[PDB]
Amino acid sequence: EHQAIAKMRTMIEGFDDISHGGLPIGRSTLVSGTSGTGKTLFSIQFLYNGIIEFDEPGVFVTFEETPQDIIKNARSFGWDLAKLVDEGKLFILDASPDPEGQEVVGGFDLSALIERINYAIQKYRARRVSIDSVTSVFQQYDASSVVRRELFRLVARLKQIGATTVMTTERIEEYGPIARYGVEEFVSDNVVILRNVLEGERRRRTLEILKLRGTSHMKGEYPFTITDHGINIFPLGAMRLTQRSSNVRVSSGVVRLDEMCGGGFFKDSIILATGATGTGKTLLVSRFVENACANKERAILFAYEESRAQLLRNAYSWGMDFEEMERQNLLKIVCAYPESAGLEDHLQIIKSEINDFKPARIAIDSLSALARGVSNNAFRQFVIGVTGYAKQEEITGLFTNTSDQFMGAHSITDSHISTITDTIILLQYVEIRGEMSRAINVFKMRGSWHDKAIREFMISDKGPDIKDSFRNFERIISGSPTRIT
Amino acid sequence: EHQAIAKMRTMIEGFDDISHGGLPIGRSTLVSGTSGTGKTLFSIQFLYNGIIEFDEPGVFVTFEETPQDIIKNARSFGWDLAKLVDEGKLFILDASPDPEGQEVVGGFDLSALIERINYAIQKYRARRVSIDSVTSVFQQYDASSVVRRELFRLVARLKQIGATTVMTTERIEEYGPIARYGVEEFVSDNVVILRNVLEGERRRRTLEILKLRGTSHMKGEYPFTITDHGINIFPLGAMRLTQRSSNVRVSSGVVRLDEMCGGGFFKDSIILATGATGTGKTLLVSRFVENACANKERAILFAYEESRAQLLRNAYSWGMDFEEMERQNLLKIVCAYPESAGLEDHLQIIKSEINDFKPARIAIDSLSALARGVSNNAFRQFVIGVTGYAKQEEITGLFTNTSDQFMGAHSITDSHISTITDTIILLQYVEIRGEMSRAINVFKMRGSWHDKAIREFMISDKGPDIKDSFRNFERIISGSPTRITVDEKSEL
Amino acid sequence: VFQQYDASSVVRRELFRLVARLKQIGATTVMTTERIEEYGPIARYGVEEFVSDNVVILRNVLEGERRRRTLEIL
Ligand SMILES: Nc1ncnc2c1ncn2[C@@H]1O[C@H](COP(=O)(O)OP(=O)(O)OP(=O)(O)O)[C@@H](O)[C@H]1O
Ligand SMILES: Nc1ncnc2c1ncn2[C@@H]1O[C@H](COP(=O)(O)OP(=O)(O)OP(=O)(O)O)[C@@H](O)[C@H]1O
Ligand SMILES: Nc1ncnc2c1ncn2[C@@H]1O[C@H](COP(=O)(O)OP(=O)(O)OP(=O)(O)O)[C@@H](O)[C@H]1O
Ligand SMILES: Nc1ncnc2c1ncn2[C@@H]1O[C@H](COP(=O)(O)OP(=O)(O)OP(=O)(O)O)[C@@H](O)[C@H]1O
Ligand SMILES: [Mg+2]
Ligand SMILES: [Mg+2]
């Protein structure tokens, strides 16, 4: 044809954005990865989504797994392929070998198979084809050049037939050659690499479109997660800087704080509370989560440092009954150890729960605990993710950070998140006469005026009481002021 | 079946959590690793727990070790296989070669072996199968493709038989190919990798479930230990943030402290005492452990810096008789150099002893010492483990930390554990008039009010005496203050 | 000895034969092997590791021009 290469949607979450529309129609895409990367799942989801969203029949050619198994496995994702096979929308073509045995039936090899796939295609009026582990077929006794030819032959016949195909390959090195024979890379029109990178005893799955002959696509690796719903990719670099921005205000749950912020936090905003350990970030969170219930709004408190029970003990000791918020179905507590997941996973759990609960406010107690272990770059990516999501969803977010050093801290954040944020509330210890007092300061607020004082404050059962500034002192920011008389 | 694959529990501690229920029934799981990683043990434990806990017979196929040796080595874990063989619950089928000699044993091999296996399975009504090192079978003269097919044949036949199987393979590189031929990884539906990673001159064993076709499972490596009870895995990432939390108070063993903490520590709480060397962390510990005996409760003191003798000399000089606490069976001391093991080992020793003694209190004199060498992330993981265990077990835990720099310390912890902890007791030196005095502060307390004073304190034979704050000083925290007030008293 | 002209599988069989006969005889044996890399495969043919009951690795590590010998029971 005379125009811009057309793409078939995969409907696999996030993939069509990365690929700028989908898989190129009528050509085949190589998808390779090491064991357990999700090659097989990709290729099934491509067919399954075809059938269920466009009523495009599919043909799935298997060389190793058994059709019963392919079917059985899909149940993991709540997919009934046996039904689809019955309705004639899906056809799994068994090309695996005889557990029993013979060695002279496939002397007509590529040729013959190519006929059965063409027969199947015509028969079911197939639009999508997935060949699972072509690699395993020549893993009979071949050399690079022999593979290049067979692959080419196949790709080509399918091109003639007009089918959009997904071919699956295996690799042994996460960052080494693209597929086993260092030849499939160049014979396909498109290449997709699925990686399961190790790094620190944790595993991180990434998907990469290495090339799409004829169109554009997002470059590099994107994290993804295999869930009950199959492959889920987050193109964190595909999120646009187009979030809605209002002037409406909301309370912090602490009136005086509201005053200092020039009448409260903005609804559309990302508020950061930083401070040495024990300064009172968590008390603010409690208070901010409570204010959303007293106004009959839903709030989620994602906790990564305290148990659901402890959170309740400490909250109740500050007034506020978290128990009720729970029943009233106005407040939801989560709680998990940063270690019980990858940032990718965490991010999704968060999104996920936000979707099932549709909160108005959200508080993540200690981003600084989520940064444990992870790389700064991996972590920043996470923050932009959760931040950006809350921002485009009109949810007001309160995030917490504990600074590594009490008193004398020379930066707002050790991870340098402060720019990714709209409002920064800052808590610090101040040594006043052999005692450790606290001080709160609205460091910055983006669309408002806010107070510039570093007010001292106390914590009682009643909660946070913000008092006055240390007017008669110098170097209050050092943590060790110098009362000047 | 219209259901997603079901799993068989291995009962191997920690494994069913990592594998979300067990191994997939009717399929085979490839377990591979380098020499001495624990392959053979995993496979034996899988059959053993199969028989002892569900009365599911097992067939163990062996290609290299002798049935007598497999039975003999299992005695290391208190397992009498010879008995089970006897009662027809376990059947070791010997597939090893005879120390004499025959050629061309590749063909009939698989097939014969397969009905030998089928025969045995059918004969004993086996539900579980372990094939030990299939690897060694084609290690007769083969190339990758021949391996791939043979494997496939075998797995397949077993699938047909309906057996849940554990297959074992060797590797030569800790992070190299999954299994010798670079082919086994793909033929198997499930793959488990046992690693015995070096690093420093210590070895750390990890288990990873790489893939389970059909279901979910935890990802990554998990440290485990081989013990007299076999493989023991700690899914430190599977521990849930659901620990019970009470408002009950308990004493620190120092009244004045108790006041400062708004009436003593919380029963449910992790306490951290920090400060430069010689400030008295160990004194606080001793006192905290004694307090649990004087109340006839059990306490364990895991010490990593002092001998059991030294602890006793120093204790007695502070009053408190550790001798009695011992006899009375209320106090138990441990002691061990951080270097005499890996963090995984330590964590387990701690847990183990907490189970045999059921303490109400526990103190670890110096986390800081356990941090010697180990990486920060390995360490933090360790702390969350001991910390969380303590917490879900209602045991009050006091941990100690020596800061790397006396005076001027700008962070509570050098390893940044301060967020993992409920109450923080800080000890510091204060230079006052050419002399080194001490100060004690309750830096933070999660559920109470605590005192914000940086009180000076002395140490005598009576123990710790907490005096008053340094009100007329600026830069206390810095360790080197400055006195103030320029108006003594004059006329009108 | 097999450094005469052999491949991995031939070595595994021969070793196994020897070790086996020795165990029958009732002897407690120490068998020595060479390696070329201080941290690579355990022994030459990457096969002796699994054929023996116990494995001990002697290392002589370089690192900064000094040499440090270590013994490990693997
Ligand atoms: N419901 C589920 N929830 C979470 N993860 C799942 C679920 N089902 C399967 N998985 C995961 O997905 C993986 C499946 O990968 P898959 O079968 O797609 O093919 P593959 O890894 O590409 O290739 P191979 O045929 O070599 O195994 C499993 O290893 C497992 O980690
Ligand atoms: N009932 C109470 N009465 C007086 N002060 C309290 C009370 N509860 C807590 N506090 C004070 O508040 C502090 C608790 O801090 P909080 O739980 O708000 O979290 P944080 O400082 O933000 O974070 P983290 O606890 O992880 O360091 C304690 O140090 C203590 O001084
Ligand atoms: N009771 C025990 N306590 C602690 N460790 C033990 C005990 N018994 C055995 N071990 C350890 O476990 C190891 C046994 O490993 P195992 O026999 O399970 O198989 P392998 O290493 O997987 O394979 P192979 O030795 O056949 O190459 C020993 O090397 C030893 O380190
Ligand atoms: N009988 C005593 N009388 C007066 N002071 C004592 C007595 N015993 C110990 N001390 C003092 O207490 C200090 C001992 O410190 P302690 O045993 O409390 O542990 P630490 O400071 O926490 O840790 P570490 O000893 O490893 O540095 C000595 O430096 C000394 O000044
Ligand atoms: Mg907190
Ligand atoms: Mg000490």
Short mmCIF file of N, CA and C and ligand atoms in Angstrom, two decimals, chain A residues 33-42 64-65 73 75-77 132-133 168-170 194 205 226-231, chain B residues 148 185-189 209-217 219, ligand 1:
data_model
loop_
_atom_site.label_atom_id
_atom_site.label_comp_id
_atom_site.label_asym_id
_atom_site.label_seq_id
_atom_site.Cartn_x
_atom_site.Cartn_y
_atom_site.Cartn_z
N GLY A 33 13.24 -13.99 25.19
CA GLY A 33 13.62 -13.84 26.57
C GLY A 33 14.13 -15.12 27.15
N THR A 34 14.66 -14.99 28.35
CA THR A 34 15.19 -16.15 29.03
C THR A 34 14.00 -16.87 29.60
N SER A 35 14.25 -18.00 30.24
CA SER A 35 13.23 -18.81 30.87
C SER A 35 12.44 -18.00 31.85
N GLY A 36 11.12 -18.17 31.78
CA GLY A 36 10.22 -17.49 32.70
C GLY A 36 10.01 -16.01 32.59
N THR A 37 10.27 -15.45 31.41
CA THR A 37 10.09 -14.03 31.22
C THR A 37 8.68 -13.65 30.78
N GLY A 38 7.92 -14.63 30.30
CA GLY A 38 6.55 -14.35 29.85
C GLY A 38 6.31 -14.29 28.31
N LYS A 39 7.22 -14.90 27.55
CA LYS A 39 7.13 -15.01 26.13
C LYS A 39 5.79 -15.68 25.77
N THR A 40 5.60 -16.89 26.33
CA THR A 40 4.41 -17.67 26.11
C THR A 40 3.11 -16.77 26.45
N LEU A 41 3.08 -16.13 27.63
CA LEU A 41 1.96 -15.27 28.02
C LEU A 41 1.78 -14.14 27.06
N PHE A 42 2.84 -13.65 26.52
CA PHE A 42 2.61 -12.52 25.63
C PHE A 42 1.86 -12.98 24.39
N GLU A 64 6.44 -27.19 22.01
CA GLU A 64 6.83 -27.93 23.20
C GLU A 64 5.68 -28.12 24.15
N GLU A 65 5.16 -27.06 24.75
CA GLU A 65 4.02 -27.31 25.60
C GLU A 65 2.89 -28.03 24.80
N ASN A 73 -2.72 -23.76 31.71
CA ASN A 73 -2.03 -22.61 32.15
C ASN A 73 -2.86 -21.33 32.03
N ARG A 75 -5.67 -20.78 32.55
CA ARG A 75 -6.66 -20.60 33.61
C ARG A 75 -6.15 -19.73 34.74
N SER A 76 -4.83 -19.58 34.79
CA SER A 76 -4.15 -18.74 35.72
C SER A 76 -4.69 -17.36 35.58
N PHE A 77 -4.94 -16.97 34.34
CA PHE A 77 -5.47 -15.64 34.09
C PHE A 77 -6.97 -15.50 33.91
N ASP A 132 5.05 -20.51 19.23
CA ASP A 132 5.74 -20.64 20.52
C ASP A 132 6.92 -21.51 20.50
N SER A 133 8.04 -20.80 20.67
CA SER A 133 9.40 -21.30 20.70
C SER A 133 9.78 -21.99 19.40
N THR A 168 8.19 -16.55 19.13
CA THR A 168 8.82 -16.55 20.44
C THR A 168 10.19 -17.22 20.48
N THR A 169 11.21 -16.57 21.07
CA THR A 169 12.55 -17.20 21.13
C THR A 169 13.09 -17.27 22.55
N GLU A 170 14.10 -18.12 22.76
CA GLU A 170 14.71 -18.20 24.07
C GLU A 170 16.13 -17.63 23.98
N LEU A 194 12.05 -9.51 26.20
CA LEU A 194 11.52 -9.58 27.57
C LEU A 194 12.65 -9.95 28.54
N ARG A 205 11.12 -7.45 35.90
CA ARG A 205 10.80 -7.73 34.50
C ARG A 205 10.71 -6.45 33.67
N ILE A 226 3.65 -9.45 35.72
CA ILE A 226 2.72 -10.50 35.26
C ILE A 226 1.71 -10.66 36.44
N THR A 227 0.42 -10.45 36.25
CA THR A 227 -0.53 -10.59 37.35
C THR A 227 -1.60 -11.55 36.99
N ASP A 228 -2.67 -11.62 37.78
CA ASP A 228 -3.80 -12.49 37.45
C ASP A 228 -4.36 -12.04 36.12
N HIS A 229 -4.20 -10.77 35.78
CA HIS A 229 -4.73 -10.31 34.51
C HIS A 229 -3.67 -10.33 33.41
N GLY A 230 -2.59 -11.04 33.67
CA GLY A 230 -1.59 -11.16 32.63
C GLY A 230 -0.63 -10.01 32.62
N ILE A 231 0.03 -9.76 31.47
CA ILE A 231 1.04 -8.72 31.36
C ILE A 231 0.51 -7.33 31.53
N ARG B 148 17.91 -31.98 25.25
CA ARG B 148 16.58 -31.42 25.20
C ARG B 148 15.46 -32.43 24.93
N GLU B 185 16.31 -25.60 31.41
CA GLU B 185 15.46 -24.47 31.86
C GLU B 185 14.13 -24.32 31.12
N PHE B 186 14.16 -24.66 29.84
CA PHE B 186 12.99 -24.47 29.00
C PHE B 186 12.09 -25.70 28.93
N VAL B 187 12.69 -26.88 28.92
CA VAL B 187 11.88 -28.07 28.88
C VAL B 187 11.02 -28.23 30.15
N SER B 188 11.50 -27.82 31.33
CA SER B 188 10.74 -27.97 32.56
C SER B 188 9.62 -26.93 32.69
N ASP B 189 8.49 -27.30 33.31
CA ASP B 189 7.36 -26.35 33.53
C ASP B 189 7.74 -25.44 34.72
N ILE B 209 12.63 -19.36 43.14
CA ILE B 209 11.73 -20.13 42.25
C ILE B 209 11.78 -19.22 41.03
N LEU B 210 12.39 -19.66 39.92
CA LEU B 210 12.50 -18.87 38.69
C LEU B 210 11.21 -18.80 37.95
N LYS B 211 10.62 -19.96 37.71
CA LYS B 211 9.30 -19.95 37.09
C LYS B 211 8.46 -21.13 37.46
N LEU B 212 7.15 -20.90 37.55
CA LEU B 212 6.16 -21.98 37.75
C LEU B 212 5.07 -21.75 36.69
N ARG B 213 5.13 -22.49 35.57
CA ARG B 213 4.07 -22.34 34.53
C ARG B 213 2.66 -22.55 35.09
N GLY B 214 1.77 -21.57 34.97
CA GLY B 214 0.43 -21.75 35.43
C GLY B 214 0.03 -20.99 36.66
N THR B 215 0.96 -20.73 37.59
CA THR B 215 0.60 -20.04 38.86
C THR B 215 1.63 -19.01 39.22
N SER B 216 1.38 -18.35 40.34
CA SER B 216 2.22 -17.30 40.84
C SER B 216 3.12 -17.91 41.91
N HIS B 217 4.07 -17.05 42.32
CA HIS B 217 5.04 -17.40 43.30
C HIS B 217 5.89 -16.19 43.63
N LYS B 219 9.08 -13.88 43.85
CA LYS B 219 10.21 -13.79 42.93
C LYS B 219 11.52 -13.47 43.63
N1 LIG D 1 -1.59 -15.80 37.79
C1 LIG D 1 -0.31 -15.56 37.82
N2 LIG D 1 0.06 -14.48 38.64
C2 LIG D 1 1.34 -14.03 38.67
N3 LIG D 1 2.30 -14.65 37.89
C3 LIG D 1 1.96 -15.71 37.10
C4 LIG D 1 0.67 -16.20 37.03
N4 LIG D 1 0.74 -17.23 36.16
C5 LIG D 1 1.97 -17.40 35.70
N5 LIG D 1 2.72 -16.46 36.28
C6 LIG D 1 4.15 -16.24 36.08
O1 LIG D 1 4.37 -16.13 34.67
C7 LIG D 1 5.31 -16.99 34.23
C8 LIG D 1 4.89 -17.64 32.97
O2 LIG D 1 5.80 -17.37 31.90
P1 LIG D 1 5.41 -18.03 30.51
O3 LIG D 1 4.69 -19.36 30.72
O4 LIG D 1 4.58 -17.03 29.93
O5 LIG D 1 6.54 -18.23 29.44
P2 LIG D 1 8.04 -18.11 29.31
O6 LIG D 1 8.64 -17.75 30.54
O7 LIG D 1 8.15 -17.05 28.41
O8 LIG D 1 8.65 -19.24 28.55
P3 LIG D 1 8.96 -20.77 28.95
O9 LIG D 1 8.01 -21.65 28.02
O10 LIG D 1 10.47 -20.97 28.82
O11 LIG D 1 8.63 -20.99 30.43
C9 LIG D 1 5.63 -17.89 35.44
O12 LIG D 1 7.04 -18.13 35.50
C10 LIG D 1 5.17 -17.10 36.62
O13 LIG D 1 6.16 -16.33 37.22
#
